[PDB]
C-alpha cells in the first residue's frame, strides 16, 4: 500500500498547526513509516501538496 484515501471530511482545529484539513476522497502519501507514532501519521496530500499529520481512522488503503 502506497496511497491512502480519505473516508470522511476532516476540518483541523485552529489549535492544531501540523494537522491536515481534508475532504472525503482525498489521496495521501505517508512520508516515513519509521517515524509513525500512534493514530496520527505525517502524510502528504495529493490535492494540496502540503505536508502534515492525518488521523489513521479517517483513512483507508488503496
Amino acid at each position: 500500500v502506497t496511497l491512502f484515501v480519505a473516508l470522511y471530511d476532516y476540518e483541523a482545529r485552529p489549535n492544531r498547526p501540523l494537522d491536515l484539513s481534508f475532504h472525503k476522497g482525498e489521496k495521501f502519501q505517508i512520508l516515513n513509516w519509521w517515524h509513525v507514532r500512534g493514530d496520527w501519521w505525517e502524510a502528504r496530500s495529493l490535492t494540496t501538496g502540503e505536508t502534515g499529520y492525518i488521523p489513521s481512522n479517517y483513512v483507508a488503503p488503496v
Binding site: V1, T2, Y53
Partner: protein, 363 residues
C-alpha cells in the same frame, strides 16, 4: 525498597508514567526515557498537549536561576531549571525534591498523537545537561528514599501497558535465569555486542562495527536502530530468508488474516556475559520486528542510524530489562506478558563460547 508503578501506552507512542508535581500537586504524563538524563516537563501551554506544569501555581517550586537547551535525534527544547516535589500516585507514600526543567520554547518535541507532556531521564549523570553536577531524578530518589541503585522495566504492548520498578527487581515480572551484560561506558546504557544472527545464518562484520559509536538500550526509541554500515547487511540477510517496505517508504499487507511471521526468520543479538569467556543470546521473533499498523498491513521495524546502535522499545517489549547501576550491569530475562495470546515472541539462551570471537568489541 522498590516502587512498582504501572506504565501506560505502547512501544509506538512510548511508555509513560503518571506523576504529581508541586503543591498543590499537578497530574502530568511523563515518558520513560533511558536514553537521556534530564527530567523535563512543559512549563507553558503548547499545541498537541492537554496539560502543563505551572511553576507560579506551586508553593514548593524553587527556581535555580538558570535554563538549559537539550537537542535530540528529532526535537529540541529550552526550559527553566528549578526544583520541586514529585509524588508517584500508586508508588511511594512520600514526596521527593528533584531537579525539574520547565519547557517554555520547543522545536519538533511535542508531536501529534503523543499522550505525554513530560520526559523522564533515567541514564547516568554525565549525560545530564547543563553538566554532571545537575542531579538526575533517580540519583535524587536513591539518596532521599535510600533505595537500591537498580531499576527494572517490563513492556507489554504486543499489538496492556507496562511496569517500572524503581529500587530493584520484582521476580514475578520474569521467567527463567537473568543474563547480565556489563555496562562498558557509564553515560548511556552501553552494552557490548559481539555478533548478530538472522534465522540461523550469521552476517560477517568486524565486532567493532556493532559498537559503531555506542551500542545502547533505549526505552524512548521505538524501533531497533542499526548503524548505516550494519543495517545494509541485515536487509540483504533477511531478504534471502523472506517494494519500499525495507526502506520504510511502503508497507506489506497479507490478505485473510494469515500471519506473515511464518515467512520471516529470527533475529538474534549476542551480548558478552559478566564472565568474559562466555556470552548469552537475545532472540526476537518477527512478531516484534514486523509491526502491525491500523486484512491488516505490516511495517518493517528496523531503521538505519547516523551515529549509534539502539535497542529500542520493540526489542525491550519481549524481555524484562534490569538496569543494575549499583553493579555496572544490564539484565535480560524472558517476560510472561511478552506473549501474543499464549504464543511467545522472545527467546533467551546461553551460555555460548567466545573463543573464536575478538577480545574487545568496544572501540
Amino acid at each position: 525498597l522498590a516502587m512498582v508503578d504501572n506504565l501506560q501506552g505502547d512501544s509506538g507512542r512510548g511508555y509513560y508514567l503518571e506523576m504529581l508535581i508541586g503543591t498543590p500537586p499537578q497530574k502530568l504524563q511523563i515518558l520513560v526515557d533511558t536514553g537521556s538524563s534530564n527530567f523535563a516537563v512543559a512549563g507553558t501551554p503548547h499545541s498537541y498537549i492537554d496539560t502543563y506544569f505551572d511553576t507560579e501555581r506551586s508553593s514548593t517550586y524553587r527556581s535555580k536561576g538558570f535554563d538549559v537547551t537539550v537537542k535530540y535525534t528529532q526535537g529540541s527544547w529550552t526550559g527553566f531549571v528549578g526544583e520541586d516535589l514529585v509524588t508517584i500516585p500508586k508508588g511511594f507514600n512520600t514526596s521527593f525534591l528533584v531537579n525539574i526543567a520547565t519547557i517554555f520554547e520547543s522545536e519538533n518535541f511535542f508531536l501529534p498523537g503523543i499522550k505525554w507532556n513530560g520526559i523522564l531521564g533515567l541514564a547516568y549523570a554525565t549525560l545530564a545537561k547543563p553538566s554532571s553536577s545537575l542531579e538526575t531524578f533517580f540519583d535524587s530518589l536513591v539518596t532521599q528514599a535510600n533505595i537500591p541503585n537498580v531499576f527494572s522495566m517490563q513492556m507489554c504492548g504486543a499489538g496492556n501497558g507496562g511496569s517500572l520498578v524503581l529500587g530493584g527487581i520484582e521476580p514475578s515480572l520474569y521467567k527463567g535465569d537473568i543474563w547480565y551484560t556489563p555496562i562498558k561506558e557509564e553515560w548511556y546504557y552501553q552494552i557490548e555486542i559481539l555478533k548478530l544472527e538472522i534465522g540461523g545464518q550469521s552476517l560477517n562484520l568486524d565486532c567493532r562495527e556493532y559498537n559503531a559509536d555506542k551500542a545502547i538500550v533505549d526505552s524512548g526509541t521505538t524501533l531497533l536502530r542499526l548503524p548505516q554500515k550494519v543495517f545494509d547487511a541485515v536487509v540483504e540477510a533477511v531478504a534471502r530468508a523472506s517494494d519500499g517496505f525495507w526502506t520504510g517508504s511502503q508497507l506489506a499487507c497479507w490478505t485473510n488474516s494469515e500471519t506473515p511471521w511464518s515467512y520471516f526468520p529470527k533475529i538474534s543479538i549476542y551480548l558478552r556475559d559478566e564472565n568474559s569467556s562466555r556470552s548469552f543470546r537475545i532472540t526476537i521473533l518477527p512478531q516484534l520486528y514486523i509491526q502491525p499498523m491500523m486484512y491488516e498491513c505490516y511495517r518493517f521495524g528496523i531503521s538505519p542510524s547516523t551515529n549509534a546502535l539502539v535497542i529500542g522499545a520493540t526489542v525491550m517489549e519481549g524481555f524484562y530489562v534490569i538496569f543494575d547501576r549499583a553493579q555496572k550491569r544490564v539484565g535480560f530475562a524472558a517476560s510472561p506478558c511478552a506473549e501474543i495470546a499464549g504464543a511467545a515472541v522472545s527467546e533467551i539462551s546461553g551460555p555460548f563460547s567466545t573463543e573464536d570471537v575478538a577480545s574487545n568489541c568496544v572501540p
